[PDB]
Design a protein around this ligand. Structure first.
Ligand SMILES: C[C@H]1COCCN1C[C@H]1CN(S(=O)(=O)c2cccs2)CCN1c1ccc([C@@](C)(O)C(F)(F)F)cc1
Ligand SMILES: O=P(O)(O)OC[C@@H](O)[C@@H](O)[C@H](O)[C@@H](O)CO
Length: 585
């Protein structure tokens, strides 16, 4: 029938009580799963939220139990990390005609950017030509923009790869897709297997290959799963690699910007840094060198979340500023500035928030005075302003801007990284009464710009900002249990996540859920056979432009009513959340 092909991969909705027994839950990719720890995230208070998300983040370092999926510390994974460092080494010995690409969509693309900068610095600091570069779905401007739609083309990913692999003789392509999902990466990886003489594909994500994405890609013949299954066979001959530990579900279901983006840096910084740090020693990469670095990243989480109460407080101030109708400014220096901007942008698609709601700033890339003349005047009693810096930064540029921001605002908490024994100038820096001081041990670093210190600090800032941006929105009641129900469908994965949320919350059949979603997307047009049979990209392109698609679809189903009736009910209610929750009662 019309649509049977498009929706063939959709598993039927199970009867109540058989969600486990039907085999449905076992087929939900780890990355999309409901994290049991956060079943009541929507009820947790600020302090609980910090705790629940700290716990979730800790899962990245949890070891493999006794049958079960491999994890970061499992020997299969560390062995693979070693073999990849090794391949990275061959290139590093032979920089002429060598390149190393880090590629991903969305937050994977953002992580790829940071890491390619860092390792480019490191080879500069040694006076070697930079061998690294990034590739992000939608070109360079996707780094600091919400552009969720650009990950859905495999030809675009291959094109970008073609641009950059120029007339190189030896290219390593690290395809990063947390969900082993993005069509952007799948075609990069497949292209690589078709020219092994030059390309070496390495795929990074956090699903087992048997849960890799398997619905058709509109511009490509193979699925991500097939691609990944074939790379896995190539790994026996060391011609492709898959690096895919389970780190457990996200605390907000499917929000791979969080653990996924964290585990991406942890995993790839660890392995790249081992590789460099051991080439110049005339030693192979070994599990032992990786381990040192992993354990440092694991200390970094303990260090970070020991500041929990102050993280919770900052969340309560971010949440208030937004509950009223203020704005939140995230102001930071060098790469923490960027991480800040990345965080604020992700809030647009993640929570349906305006670009002003949580915005990042680097010293998007504004000057001391420029920020002072331009942005400073727009501030107000109710806003929250966050400063994010090292004691190594230029604290005279820092102290100025806080001086000036104190005038027009008082909610100004801050996030300061220091190596132990450094002191915070102005002991009357009770400009910041209750700072977030993260103090780091002394570690032995033989490289120039202390990269392990950079990586620690970036990760810890990432975690604080992610937990804050995310907690602030849950407190406002925008999250339903641990699901973001009212997302904007802006790519095929989101379209599938929407369909899944409909099955999970209504309990009704696949055909009904699908019908209600398409009716909601295409209203006021009725369901035709063309619409039913359309590529998912047509549904996406229409939904992207609307509001409350998913909640309307769900109300239609719960009330067993039309779209006209569900839209009128939604308008009768005080809020979307209240409409939905009271309909769920
Ligand atoms: C639509 C459902 C059921 O049929 C198979 C597809 N399922 C959706 C899964 C996976 N999709 S995906 O195909 O884009 C993908 C595969 C691999 C990486 S992405 C994404 C969303 N999925 C999903 C999401 C949420 C659920 C929930 C909502 O049931 C819960 F979060 F609770 F698990 C279930 C499945
Ligand atoms: O790395 P993946 O699974 O290919 O996901 C790629 C992107 O969709 C993802 O990073 C998304 O932009 C974030 O908003 C998820 O919280």
């Amino acid at each position: 029938m019309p649509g049977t092909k498009r929706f063939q991969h959709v598993i039927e909705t199970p009867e109540p009580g058989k969600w486990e027994l039907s085999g449905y839950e076992a087929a939900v990719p780890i990355t999309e799963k409901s994290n049991p720890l956060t079943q009541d995230l929507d009820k947790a208070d600020a302090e609980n939220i910090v705790r629940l998300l700290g716990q979730c983040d800790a899962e990245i370092f949890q070891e493999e139990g006794q049958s079960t999926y491999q994890r970061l510390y499992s020997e299969s994974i560390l062995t693979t990390m070693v073999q990849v460092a090794g391949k990275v080494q061959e290139v590093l010995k032979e920089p002429d005609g060598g390149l190393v690409v880090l590629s991903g969509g969305g937050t994977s693309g953002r992580m790829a950017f940071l890491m390619s900068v860092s390792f480019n610095q490191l080879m500069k600091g040694l006076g070697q030509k930079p061998l690294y570069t990034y590739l992000i779905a939608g070109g360079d401007r996707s780094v600091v923009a919400s552009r969720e739609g650009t990950e859905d083309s495999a030809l675009h990913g291959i094109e970008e790869l073609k641009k950059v692999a120029a007339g190189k003789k030896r290219v390593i392509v690290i395809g990063i897709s947390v969900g082993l999902s993005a069509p952007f990466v799948a075609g990069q990886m497949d292209c690589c297997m078709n020219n092994t003489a030059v390309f070496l594909p390495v795929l990074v994500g956090f699903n087992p290959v048997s849960m890799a994405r398997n619905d058709p890609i509109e511009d490509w013949s193979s699925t991500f799963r097939q691609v990944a299954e074939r790379m896995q066979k190539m790994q026996e001959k060391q011609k492709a690699f898959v690096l895919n530990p389970a780190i457990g579900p996200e605390g907000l279901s499917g929000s791979s910007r969080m653990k996924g983006g964290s585990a991406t840096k942890i995993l790839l910084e660890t392995l790249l840094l081992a590789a460099h740090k051991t080439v110049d020693q005339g030693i192979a990469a070994s599990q032992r060198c990786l381990l040192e670095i992993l354990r440092t990243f694991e200390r970094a989480h303990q260090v970070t979340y020991s500041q929990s109460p102050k993280i919770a407080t900052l969340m309560k101030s971010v949440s208030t500023s937004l509950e009223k109708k203020g704005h939140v400014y995230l102001v930071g220096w060098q790469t923490l500035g960027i991480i800040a901007i990345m965080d604020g942008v992700e809030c647009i698609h993640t929570f349906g928030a305006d670009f002003r709601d949580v915005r990042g700033f680097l010293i998007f890339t504004f000057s001391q005075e420029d920020f002072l003349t331009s942005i400073l005047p727009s501030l107000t009693e109710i806003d929250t302003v966050v400063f994010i810096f090292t004691l190594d930064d230029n604290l005279t540029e820092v102290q100025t801007i806080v001086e000036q921001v104190k005038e027009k605002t008082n909610h100004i908490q801050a996030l300061a990284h220091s190596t132990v024994g450094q002191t915070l100038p102005i002991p009357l820096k009770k400009l910041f009464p209750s700072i977030i001081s993260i103090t780091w041990p002394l570690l032995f670093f033989e490289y120039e710009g202390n990269f392990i210190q950079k990586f620690q600090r970036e990760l810890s800032t990432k975690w604080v900002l992610n937990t804050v941006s995310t907690g602030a929105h849950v407190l406002l009641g925008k999250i339903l249990q641990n699901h973001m129900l009212d997302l904007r469908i802006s790519n095929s994965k989101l379209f599938w996540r929407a369909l899944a949320m409909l099955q999970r919350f209504s309990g009704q059949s696949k055909a009904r859920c699908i019908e209600s979603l398409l009716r909601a997307i295409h209203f006021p047009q009725p369901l035709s056979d063309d619409i039913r049979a359309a590529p998912i990209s047509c549904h996406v392109q229409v939904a992207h432009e609307k509001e409350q698609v998913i909640p309307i679809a769900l109300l239609s189903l719960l009330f067993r009513c039309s779209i006209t009736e569900a839209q009128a009910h939604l308008a009768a209610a005080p809020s979307v959340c209240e409409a939905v929750r009271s309909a769920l009662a």
